[PDB]
Amino acid sequence: GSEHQGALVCLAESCLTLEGPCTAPPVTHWAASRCKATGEAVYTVPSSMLCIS
Amino acid sequence: QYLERTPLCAILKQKAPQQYRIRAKLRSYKPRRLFQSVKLHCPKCHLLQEVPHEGDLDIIFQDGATKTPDVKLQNTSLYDSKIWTTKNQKGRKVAVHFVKNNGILPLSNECLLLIEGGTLSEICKLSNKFNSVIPVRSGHEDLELLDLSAPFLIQGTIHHYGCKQCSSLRSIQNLNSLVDKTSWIPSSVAEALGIVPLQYVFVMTFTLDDGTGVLEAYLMDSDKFFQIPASEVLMDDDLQKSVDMIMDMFCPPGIKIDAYPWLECFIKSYNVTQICYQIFDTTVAEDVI
Ligand SMILES: [Zn+2]
């Protein structure tokens, strides 16, 4: 029925931000450290150095 | 009964490939910035890739928000569609498509959403209330995946990515081919869309020292070593703290190697074409909590 559909539409709408200023979301501490460390060298190993199976 | 440990000086004098049970202290490790350990690995082409940053994803999703959802692609036998208008967002319009199972919408926790014009924040909130989210755009004849640079499926805290090289991208109607529309197995979703899924792995380089020798050994695994899924860690603050504390336990900054605990593990040697080493069949998490 449409009333179950209606419920899902309301649940969807509750997750959206359709008005006002789109504020910045609260982020985890690795992602915060990641944002700060932009520009610096990125640790990297070529896949040929690793043993994959 | 027969637990014996091979000294590192012995291992360094031997030819590869072989396997060794060792005990050594973690003198040092890379990466120093632990978030850089989380890599994406294609099982098909064996390429290693960086996980896109928030900023990278924000660009993609904002760019998606400039495009107007096509009314022709709304309300099919596969999904019901709803369009929200906005205010003070450059005239943005968000389309959410609710995927049906046999012409019926399932419960929210079994219901897959396809979204046009949503932000990363909105997508992540939707992923809490619903089974999963695919970011999509209005193609010429069908809905299509927004961009393989962004996740092809967000499910729980897991942002699933696909290999750009190996994938042959198919349009959204191909989700009809899935056995049900309530389980939403990531690999099944990927196959339906012609996507080869990337695998999350912790990649680190350990410098091991047992006082007889020194050796560089790689870590490459998804969930065995830490008993923390690499697929969840970047979106879970508690799992990040656990990885921090485990690395801080084995190799605490400042203090001397004399005080570090011992790491019990297996390592396999192998020939690159020089001999490299890699940890296997090892978890620190079974005896530490
Ligand atoms: Zn690939």
Protein model, in words:
- The complex is a heterodimer of chains A (53) and B (289).
- Chain A is mostly helical and 53 residues long.
- Chain A has one domain.
- Chain A is built from 2 helices and no strands.
- Chain A is elongated.
- Chain B is α+β, with helices and mostly antiparallel strands.
- Chain B folds into 2 domains: 145 residues, no CATH class; 144 residues, no CATH class.
- Chain B is built from 6 helices and 14 strands.
- In chain B, strands 1-11-12-14-13 form a 5-stranded mixed barrel.
- The radius of gyration of chain B is 23 Å and the shape is elongated.
- Chains A and B meet through helix 1 and helix 2 of A and strand 4, strand 5, helix 3 and helix 6 of B.
Q: What's the topology here?
A:
The complex is a heterodimer of chains A (53) and B (289).
Chain A: H1 2-15, H2 29-36
Chain B: H1 8-12, E1 19-30, E2 38-41, E3 48-50, H2 54-64, E4 79-85, E5 93-99, E6 112-116, H3 120-129, E7 132-138, E8 143-145, E9 153-155, E10 158-160, H4 186-192, E11 199-209, E12 214-221, H5 230-233, H6 237-250, E13 263-271, E14 275-280
Parallel strand pairs in B: 6-7, 12-14
Antiparallel strand pairs in B: 1-11, 1-13, 2-3, 2-11, 4-5, 5-6, 7-8, 9-10, 11-12, 13-14
Bound molecules: zinc ion.
Zinc ion binds at residues 42, 44-45, 47, 163, 165-166, 196 of chain B.
